Short mmCIF file of N, CA and C in Angstrom, two decimals:
data_model
loop_
_atom_site.label_atom_id
_atom_site.label_comp_id
_atom_site.label_asym_id
_atom_site.label_seq_id
_atom_site.Cartn_x
_atom_site.Cartn_y
_atom_site.Cartn_z
N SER A 9 1.09 -1.36 0.21
CA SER A 9 -0.20 -0.30 -0.11
C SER A 9 0.90 1.33 -0.02
N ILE A 10 2.15 1.34 0.52
CA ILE A 10 2.80 2.55 0.88
C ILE A 10 4.11 2.17 0.04
N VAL A 11 4.41 3.38 -1.08
CA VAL A 11 5.74 3.48 -1.42
C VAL A 11 7.09 3.55 -0.74
N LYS A 12 7.51 2.69 -0.12
CA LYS A 12 8.30 2.99 0.86
C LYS A 12 10.00 3.57 0.44
N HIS A 13 10.33 2.59 -1.00
CA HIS A 13 11.52 3.28 -1.34
C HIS A 13 11.46 3.43 -3.13
N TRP A 14 11.85 4.50 -3.18
CA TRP A 14 11.81 5.51 -4.29
C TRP A 14 12.91 6.36 -4.32
N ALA A 15 13.22 6.92 -5.85
CA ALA A 15 14.27 7.95 -5.72
C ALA A 15 14.03 9.04 -6.55
N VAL A 16 14.84 10.03 -6.70
CA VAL A 16 14.59 11.00 -7.75
C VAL A 16 15.95 11.24 -7.99
N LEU A 17 15.94 11.48 -9.70
CA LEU A 17 17.08 11.92 -10.27
C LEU A 17 16.51 13.28 -11.01
N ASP A 18 17.39 13.95 -10.60
CA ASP A 18 17.01 15.72 -10.99
C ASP A 18 18.09 16.17 -11.89
N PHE A 19 18.08 16.20 -13.18
CA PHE A 19 18.50 16.51 -14.31
C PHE A 19 18.77 17.92 -14.51
N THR A 20 17.88 18.84 -13.73
CA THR A 20 17.76 19.97 -13.94
C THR A 20 18.42 20.99 -12.97
N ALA A 21 19.34 20.33 -11.85
CA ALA A 21 19.81 20.82 -10.97
C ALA A 21 20.90 22.13 -11.14
N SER A 22 21.44 22.15 -12.24
CA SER A 22 22.54 22.95 -12.73
C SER A 22 21.75 23.97 -13.70
N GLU A 23 20.82 23.55 -13.76
CA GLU A 23 19.97 24.42 -15.26
C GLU A 23 20.18 25.93 -15.17
N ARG A 24 19.61 26.07 -14.04
CA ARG A 24 19.49 27.49 -13.37
C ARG A 24 17.92 28.13 -13.89
N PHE A 25 17.77 27.75 -15.07
CA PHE A 25 16.33 28.24 -15.38
C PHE A 25 15.60 26.86 -15.27
N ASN A 26 14.19 27.01 -14.86
CA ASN A 26 13.56 25.58 -15.01
C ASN A 26 14.23 24.61 -13.92
N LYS A 27 14.87 25.19 -12.98
CA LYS A 27 15.19 24.34 -11.93
C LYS A 27 13.92 23.70 -10.97
N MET A 28 14.00 22.41 -10.59
CA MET A 28 12.82 22.04 -9.84
C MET A 28 13.00 22.57 -8.65
N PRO A 29 11.94 23.20 -7.91
CA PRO A 29 12.10 23.83 -7.02
C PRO A 29 12.04 23.10 -5.66
N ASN A 30 12.41 23.51 -4.85
CA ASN A 30 12.87 22.70 -3.31
C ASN A 30 11.57 22.27 -2.52
N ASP A 31 10.38 22.69 -2.90
CA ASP A 31 9.37 22.02 -2.47
C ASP A 31 8.51 20.95 -3.28
N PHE A 32 9.04 20.79 -4.32
CA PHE A 32 8.23 20.45 -5.26
C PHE A 32 7.87 19.01 -5.28
N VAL A 33 9.11 18.06 -4.42
CA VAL A 33 8.73 16.67 -4.30
C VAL A 33 7.69 16.25 -2.99
N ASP A 34 7.79 17.44 -1.93
CA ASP A 34 7.00 17.26 -0.75
C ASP A 34 5.74 17.65 -1.00
N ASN A 35 5.63 18.49 -2.11
CA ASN A 35 4.29 18.89 -2.65
C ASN A 35 3.67 17.73 -3.46
N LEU A 36 4.37 17.20 -4.29
CA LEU A 36 4.02 16.25 -5.29
C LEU A 36 3.58 14.95 -4.13
N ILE A 37 4.10 14.41 -3.03
CA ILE A 37 3.87 13.64 -1.99
C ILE A 37 2.40 13.80 -1.40
N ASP A 38 2.22 15.24 -1.19
CA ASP A 38 1.02 15.40 -0.31
C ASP A 38 -0.16 15.31 -1.56
N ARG A 39 0.14 15.47 -2.67
CA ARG A 39 -0.58 15.53 -4.18
C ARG A 39 -1.24 13.87 -4.07
N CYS A 40 0.13 13.16 -3.87
CA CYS A 40 -0.29 11.45 -4.05
C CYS A 40 -1.39 11.26 -3.12
N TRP A 41 -0.74 11.43 -1.69
CA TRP A 41 -1.28 11.26 -0.69
C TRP A 41 -3.10 11.55 -0.75
N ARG A 42 -3.29 12.66 -1.22
CA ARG A 42 -4.65 13.15 -1.42
C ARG A 42 -5.59 12.26 -2.34
N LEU A 43 -4.58 11.68 -3.49
CA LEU A 43 -5.22 10.52 -3.92
C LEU A 43 -5.57 9.19 -3.31
N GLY A 44 -5.00 9.14 -2.34
CA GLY A 44 -5.00 7.68 -1.61
C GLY A 44 -3.74 6.84 -1.80
N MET A 45 -2.43 7.46 -2.48
CA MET A 45 -1.26 7.23 -2.55
C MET A 45 -0.35 7.27 -1.62
N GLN A 46 0.07 6.62 -0.64
CA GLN A 46 1.12 6.99 0.53
C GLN A 46 2.20 6.81 0.12
N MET A 47 3.72 7.76 -0.18
CA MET A 47 4.73 7.56 -0.38
C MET A 47 5.41 8.19 0.71
N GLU A 48 6.75 7.31 1.10
CA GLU A 48 7.38 8.30 2.09
C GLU A 48 8.49 9.09 1.44
N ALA A 49 9.05 9.60 2.08
CA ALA A 49 10.58 10.57 1.32
C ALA A 49 10.98 9.25 0.22
N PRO A 50 11.66 9.89 -0.72
CA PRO A 50 12.87 9.31 -1.70
C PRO A 50 13.67 8.78 -0.95
N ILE A 51 14.25 7.76 -0.81
CA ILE A 51 15.70 7.63 0.17
C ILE A 51 16.77 7.98 -0.81
N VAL A 52 16.71 8.29 -1.75
CA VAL A 52 17.65 8.72 -2.66
C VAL A 52 17.25 9.85 -3.57
N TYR A 53 17.73 11.25 -3.43
CA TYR A 53 17.86 12.28 -4.32
C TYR A 53 19.25 12.66 -4.97
N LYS A 54 19.22 12.32 -6.06
CA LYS A 54 20.56 12.55 -6.90
C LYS A 54 20.57 13.56 -8.00
N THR A 55 21.32 14.42 -8.30
CA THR A 55 21.23 15.37 -9.51
C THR A 55 22.23 14.62 -10.52
N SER A 56 21.95 15.34 -11.67
CA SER A 56 23.01 14.96 -12.90
C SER A 56 22.80 16.21 -13.83
N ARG A 57 23.57 16.10 -14.98
CA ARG A 57 23.41 17.25 -15.93
C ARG A 57 22.59 16.47 -17.07
N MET A 58 22.01 17.58 -17.40
CA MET A 58 21.02 16.87 -19.01
C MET A 58 21.90 16.13 -19.82
N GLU A 59 23.32 16.54 -19.96
CA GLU A 59 24.37 16.24 -21.00
C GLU A 59 24.39 14.50 -20.72
N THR A 60 24.39 14.06 -19.54
CA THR A 60 24.60 13.25 -19.57
C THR A 60 23.59 11.85 -20.28
N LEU A 61 22.53 12.46 -20.61
CA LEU A 61 21.45 11.54 -21.43
C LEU A 61 21.87 11.27 -22.42
N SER A 62 23.04 11.78 -22.98
CA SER A 62 23.48 11.81 -24.26
C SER A 62 24.48 10.34 -24.33
N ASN A 63 24.69 10.08 -23.34
CA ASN A 63 25.73 8.90 -22.93
C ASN A 63 24.91 7.58 -22.37
N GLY A 64 24.78 6.57 -23.07
CA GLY A 64 24.25 5.37 -22.61
C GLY A 64 24.86 4.77 -21.42
N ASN A 65 26.36 4.75 -21.44
CA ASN A 65 27.11 4.22 -20.60
C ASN A 65 27.22 4.92 -18.97
N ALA A 66 27.07 6.33 -19.68
CA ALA A 66 26.72 6.93 -18.30
C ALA A 66 25.58 7.21 -17.68
N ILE A 67 24.34 6.70 -18.61
CA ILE A 67 23.36 6.57 -17.89
C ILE A 67 23.10 5.28 -16.85
N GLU A 68 23.48 4.34 -17.52
CA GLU A 68 23.58 2.89 -16.67
C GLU A 68 24.33 3.07 -15.74
N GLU A 69 25.59 3.87 -15.55
CA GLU A 69 26.13 3.83 -14.03
C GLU A 69 25.38 5.03 -13.36
N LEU A 70 24.97 6.07 -13.72
CA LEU A 70 23.97 6.78 -12.98
C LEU A 70 22.78 6.09 -12.09
N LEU A 71 22.35 5.25 -12.83
CA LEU A 71 20.99 4.33 -12.17
C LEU A 71 21.64 3.49 -11.22
N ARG A 72 22.75 2.97 -11.74
CA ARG A 72 23.38 1.87 -10.52
C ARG A 72 24.14 2.49 -9.43
N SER A 73 24.55 3.88 -9.49
CA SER A 73 24.99 4.43 -8.29
C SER A 73 23.95 4.97 -7.52
N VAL A 74 22.49 5.29 -8.16
CA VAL A 74 21.43 5.42 -7.43
C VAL A 74 21.04 4.56 -6.49
N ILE A 75 21.29 2.70 -7.04
CA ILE A 75 20.71 1.86 -6.63
C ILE A 75 22.01 1.58 -5.32
N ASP A 76 22.87 1.95 -5.48
CA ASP A 76 24.01 1.71 -4.57
C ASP A 76 24.05 2.63 -3.50
N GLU A 77 23.80 3.92 -3.58
CA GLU A 77 23.52 4.76 -2.34
C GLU A 77 22.44 4.45 -1.72
N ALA A 78 21.06 4.06 -2.58
CA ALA A 78 19.91 3.40 -1.43
C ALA A 78 20.39 2.30 -0.74
N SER A 79 21.18 1.36 -1.09
CA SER A 79 21.57 0.22 -0.45
C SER A 79 22.46 0.84 0.82
N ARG A 80 23.35 1.95 0.59
CA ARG A 80 24.23 1.98 1.74
C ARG A 80 23.41 2.85 2.65
N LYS A 81 22.46 3.62 2.14
CA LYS A 81 22.11 4.94 2.94
C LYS A 81 20.74 4.21 3.95
N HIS A 82 20.28 3.47 3.35
CA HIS A 82 19.07 2.87 3.87
C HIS A 82 19.04 1.27 3.99
N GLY A 83 20.07 0.74 4.71
CA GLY A 83 20.01 -0.82 5.15
C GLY A 83 19.73 -1.97 3.95
N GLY A 84 20.21 -1.55 2.94
CA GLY A 84 19.91 -2.35 1.79
C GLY A 84 18.59 -2.43 1.00
N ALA A 85 17.69 -1.17 1.08
CA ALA A 85 16.74 -1.09 0.44
C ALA A 85 16.92 -0.81 -1.02
N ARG A 86 15.96 -1.22 -1.93
CA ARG A 86 16.38 -0.87 -3.40
C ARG A 86 15.28 -0.17 -3.97
N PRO A 87 15.49 1.04 -4.83
CA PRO A 87 14.20 1.76 -5.13
C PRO A 87 13.31 1.06 -6.31
N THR A 88 12.29 1.20 -6.24
CA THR A 88 11.34 0.60 -7.43
C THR A 88 11.01 1.76 -8.38
N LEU A 89 10.44 2.91 -7.94
CA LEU A 89 10.04 4.22 -9.10
C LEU A 89 11.54 5.00 -8.70
N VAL A 90 11.70 5.39 -10.20
CA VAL A 90 12.86 6.33 -10.25
C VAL A 90 12.13 7.65 -10.77
N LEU A 91 11.64 8.58 -9.66
CA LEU A 91 11.16 9.67 -10.66
C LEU A 91 12.16 10.54 -11.45
N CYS A 92 12.17 11.01 -12.69
CA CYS A 92 13.26 11.64 -13.48
C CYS A 92 12.73 13.42 -13.59
N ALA A 93 13.19 14.27 -13.06
CA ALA A 93 12.91 15.60 -13.46
C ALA A 93 13.76 16.46 -14.60
N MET A 94 13.27 16.82 -15.60
CA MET A 94 14.22 17.24 -17.06
C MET A 94 13.44 18.73 -17.23
N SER A 95 14.40 19.38 -17.82
CA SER A 95 14.09 20.66 -18.19
C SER A 95 14.05 20.75 -19.73
N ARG A 96 13.96 19.86 -20.60
CA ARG A 96 13.41 19.97 -21.75
C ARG A 96 13.14 18.59 -22.50
N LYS A 97 12.71 18.17 -23.21
CA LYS A 97 12.55 16.97 -23.93
C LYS A 97 13.84 16.45 -24.44
N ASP A 98 14.56 15.16 -24.14
CA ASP A 98 15.66 14.62 -24.41
C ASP A 98 15.47 13.16 -24.67
N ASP A 99 15.82 12.63 -25.93
CA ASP A 99 15.19 11.24 -26.25
C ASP A 99 16.15 10.34 -25.53
N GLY A 100 17.14 10.88 -24.93
CA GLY A 100 17.95 10.03 -24.00
C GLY A 100 17.27 9.29 -23.26
N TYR A 101 15.99 9.78 -22.46
CA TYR A 101 15.29 9.10 -21.58
C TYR A 101 14.88 8.08 -22.10
N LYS A 102 14.68 7.75 -23.44
CA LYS A 102 14.36 6.48 -24.15
C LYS A 102 15.10 5.50 -23.58
N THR A 103 16.54 5.77 -23.53
CA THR A 103 17.46 4.77 -23.42
C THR A 103 17.46 4.42 -21.88
N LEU A 104 17.29 5.74 -21.19
CA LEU A 104 17.17 5.39 -19.68
C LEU A 104 16.25 4.45 -19.14
N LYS A 105 14.90 4.69 -19.83
CA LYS A 105 13.67 3.89 -19.65
C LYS A 105 14.10 2.64 -19.80
N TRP A 106 14.86 2.00 -20.84
CA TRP A 106 14.98 0.76 -21.27
C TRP A 106 16.02 0.13 -20.27
N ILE A 107 17.12 0.66 -19.95
CA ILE A 107 18.18 0.12 -19.15
C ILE A 107 17.37 0.07 -17.69
N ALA A 108 16.83 1.27 -17.22
CA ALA A 108 15.98 1.12 -16.07
C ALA A 108 15.00 0.05 -15.95
N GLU A 109 14.11 -0.05 -16.73
CA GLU A 109 13.05 -1.20 -16.56
C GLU A 109 13.30 -2.86 -17.05
N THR A 110 14.07 -2.76 -18.04
CA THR A 110 14.49 -4.08 -18.44
C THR A 110 15.70 -4.89 -18.07
N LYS A 111 16.79 -3.60 -17.77
CA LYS A 111 18.00 -4.15 -16.97
C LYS A 111 18.01 -4.43 -15.54
N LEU A 112 17.45 -3.10 -14.82
CA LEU A 112 17.55 -2.87 -13.49
C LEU A 112 16.23 -3.49 -12.80
N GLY A 113 15.01 -3.60 -13.33
CA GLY A 113 13.95 -3.84 -12.64
C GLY A 113 13.46 -2.94 -11.91
N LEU A 114 13.51 -1.63 -12.51
CA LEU A 114 13.22 -0.36 -11.93
C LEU A 114 11.91 -0.03 -12.52
N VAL A 115 10.86 1.00 -12.40
CA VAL A 115 10.12 1.60 -12.93
C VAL A 115 10.31 3.07 -13.12
N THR A 116 10.25 3.61 -14.24
CA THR A 116 10.52 5.03 -14.21
C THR A 116 9.36 6.17 -14.74
N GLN A 117 9.49 7.16 -14.31
CA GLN A 117 8.46 8.22 -14.77
C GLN A 117 9.29 9.82 -15.09
N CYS A 118 9.24 10.03 -16.18
CA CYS A 118 10.04 11.23 -16.44
C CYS A 118 8.80 12.58 -16.53
N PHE A 119 9.46 14.00 -16.27
CA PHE A 119 8.44 14.86 -16.28
C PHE A 119 9.46 16.15 -16.70
N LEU A 120 8.63 17.37 -17.22
CA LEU A 120 9.26 18.46 -17.39
C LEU A 120 8.95 19.41 -16.49
N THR A 121 10.01 20.27 -15.87
CA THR A 121 9.84 20.92 -14.68
C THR A 121 9.21 22.16 -14.99
N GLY A 122 9.38 22.46 -16.61
CA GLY A 122 8.71 23.84 -17.07
C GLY A 122 7.30 24.10 -16.91
N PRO A 123 6.35 23.10 -17.38
CA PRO A 123 5.30 22.87 -17.65
C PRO A 123 4.48 22.70 -15.95
N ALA A 124 5.70 21.92 -15.07
CA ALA A 124 5.04 21.47 -13.76
C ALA A 124 4.88 22.58 -12.84
N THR A 125 5.79 23.55 -12.92
CA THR A 125 5.87 24.85 -12.16
C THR A 125 5.27 25.93 -12.96
N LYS A 126 4.96 26.93 -12.23
CA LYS A 126 4.22 27.92 -12.50
C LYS A 126 3.20 27.97 -13.50
N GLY A 127 1.73 27.84 -13.26
CA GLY A 127 0.51 27.37 -13.69
C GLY A 127 0.47 26.06 -14.31
N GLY A 128 0.88 25.25 -13.58
CA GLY A 128 1.06 23.70 -13.62
C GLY A 128 0.29 23.05 -12.92
N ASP A 129 -0.81 23.20 -12.35
CA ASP A 129 -1.57 22.61 -11.34
C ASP A 129 -2.22 21.17 -12.28
N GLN A 130 -2.42 21.28 -13.37
CA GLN A 130 -3.22 20.30 -14.13
C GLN A 130 -2.13 19.29 -14.84
N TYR A 131 -0.82 20.01 -14.87
CA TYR A 131 0.08 18.91 -15.37
C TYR A 131 0.35 18.32 -13.99
N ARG A 132 0.63 18.75 -12.76
CA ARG A 132 1.13 18.09 -11.67
C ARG A 132 -0.13 17.05 -11.26
N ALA A 133 -1.34 17.50 -11.47
CA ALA A 133 -2.58 16.41 -11.02
C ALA A 133 -1.95 15.08 -11.88
N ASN A 134 -1.94 15.51 -13.29
CA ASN A 134 -1.51 14.52 -14.43
C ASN A 134 -0.36 13.43 -13.96
N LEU A 135 0.97 14.20 -13.62
CA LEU A 135 1.86 13.44 -12.85
C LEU A 135 1.52 12.42 -12.00
N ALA A 136 0.67 12.82 -11.10
CA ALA A 136 0.50 12.22 -9.63
C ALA A 136 -0.51 11.03 -10.01
N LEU A 137 -1.26 11.26 -11.29
CA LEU A 137 -2.11 10.08 -11.49
C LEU A 137 -1.07 8.77 -12.42
N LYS A 138 -0.29 9.32 -13.05
CA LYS A 138 0.70 8.41 -13.77
C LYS A 138 1.42 7.69 -12.84
N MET A 139 2.14 8.66 -11.83
CA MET A 139 2.68 7.50 -10.58
C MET A 139 1.92 6.76 -10.21
N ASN A 140 0.59 7.06 -9.70
CA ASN A 140 0.06 6.31 -8.89
C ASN A 140 -0.55 4.73 -9.75
N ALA A 141 -0.74 5.09 -11.13
CA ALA A 141 -0.94 3.86 -11.70
C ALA A 141 0.35 3.11 -11.82
N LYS A 142 1.46 3.34 -12.08
CA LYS A 142 2.69 3.00 -12.14
C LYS A 142 3.11 1.91 -10.73
N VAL A 143 2.77 2.79 -9.66
CA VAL A 143 3.13 2.07 -8.57
C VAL A 143 1.96 2.23 -7.53
#
């Protein structure tokens, strides 16, 4: 019933423009809670540059370091959902999803910080609905 182990990959941290705000995850968790979906805090928050999505081997390592960090910081827990925040569309996500879901036994969900912030209530509602359906 509860999403105990999940992670955030923030590709927007260095962006400066369209950086995911610091209250966005906690707001999002409140939003899922309102739908009947209880999530704990993500056991891993990791930032990366958008450029990373251009390199498949770097994607694979990024995901594997999320898994390793969760294991070290939370007694061996393994994330299931990995929420990915991006500042613009990037077809690299397609590679990331494949590695994540078919190689690593993860479930991923991507979103754009632009549409999600400032005038984004309906975008955020749709995000919470997709997350709820996935996990």
